């Protein structure tokens, strides 16, 4: 039930350990353009939120 | 792990056949070349080579 | 010139590139940072089913 674009849900991420490699087996992933940190060098960082 | 595959699976997990062609474009006696008909050699006379 | 051919998962097609990190660019097939060459990819679902 992904929300409509005019009312987009914003899910906050609390404290955890995040590995951005299990994502690739969740969706077809047509486009993965990432405008900040490089997608490949992403498991090696810790985020404020 | 294996790659059992069926048409039922969706986009992104479909097998992409990929071939990379790697060439060492460097100073050496060339082996593979393009389709250009070589001309005669001219000496002691300003030309484009 | 060397033609290295294989077939991989679609989400990993962008991972066959110089200086990338992940399951396939660290453990399966790594491409050098100063790679010069072409990469060609397409689908193969017509028979891989």
Identify how the structure was determined: cryo-EM
Q: Which residues pair with C39 in a beta bridge?
A: B20
- Put simply, the answer to whether C39 touches B18 (Cβ < 8 Å) is yes
CA dist B8 to A20, A28, B39, C35, C49, Å?
26, 13, 57, 36, 9
Q: Which of B14, B40, B24, A12 is nearest to C42 (CA)?
A: B14
Alpha helices in B1-49 (DSSP H): none
Q: Where does C1-49 have alpha helices with state H?
A: 23-27
Please calculate the CA angle C27-A24-A27 and round it to the nearest 5 degrees: 155
Nearest CA in chain B to A31: B12
Q: Please check whether residue A43 is in contact with residue C20, taking contact to mean a CB–CB distance below 8 angstroms.
A: no
Spell out which residues of chain C touch residue B22, defining contact as CB-CB under 8 Å.
1-2, 4, 35-37
Give chain C's radius of gyration (CA, Å).
12
For residue C26, list its beta bridge partners: none
Q: What are phi and psi of C43, to 5 degrees?
A: -85, 160
**A14 vs C45: CA distance, rounded Å:** 40
Work out the burial of residue B16: count CB atoms within 10 Å of its CB; fewer than 13 is exposed, 13-18 middle, 19 or more buried: buried
Select the residue of B16, B20, B24 nearest C7 (Cβ to Cβ): B16
Closest-CA residue to A30 (of B9, C13, B28): C13
How far apart, in whole angstroms, are the C-alpha atoms of residue B31 and residue A48?
Answer: 55
Nearest to C21 among A25, A28, A41 (CB): A41
Exposure string (b/e) for B21-49, b if CB count within 10 Å is 16 or more? eeeeeeeeeeeeeeeeeeeeeeeeeeeee
Q: Which of C1, C27, C32 is nearest to C17 (CA)?
A: C32
Residue C25 and residue C16 in contact, taking contact as beta carbons nearer than 8 Å: yes
Asked whether the beta carbons of residue C15 and residue A40 sit closer than 8 angstroms, the reply is yes
State the DSSP code for C14: G
Q: Six-digit token pair at C46? A: 């017509």
What DSSP character marks residue C10?
A: G
Q: Which residue has the tokens 């089913």?
A: C49
Specified resolution (Å): 3.3
* Pairing status of strand C37-43 against strand B15-22: antiparallel
The DSSP element (H or E) to which C39 belongs, if any, is strand C37-43
């Amino acid at each position: 039930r992904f929300a409509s674009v005019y009312a987009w849900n914003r899910k906050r991420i609390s404290n955890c350990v995040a590995d951005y490699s299990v994502l690739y087996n969740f969706a077809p992933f047509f486009a993965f353009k990432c405008y900040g940190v490089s997608p490949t060098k992403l498991n090696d960082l810790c985020f404020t939120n | 792990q294996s790659y059992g595959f069926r048409p039922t699976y969706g986009v992104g997990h479909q097998p992409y056949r990929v071939v990379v062609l790697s060439f060492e474009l460097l100073h050496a006696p060339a082996t593979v070349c393009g389709p250009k008909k070589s001309t005669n050699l001219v000496k002691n006379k300003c030309v484009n080579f | 010139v060397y033609a290295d051919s294989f077939v991989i998962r679609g989400n990993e097609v962008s991972q066959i590139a110089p200086g990338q990190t992940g399951n396939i660019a660290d453990y399966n097939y790594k491409l050098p940072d100063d790679f010069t060459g072409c990469v060609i990819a397409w689908n193969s679902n017509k028979l891989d089913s």
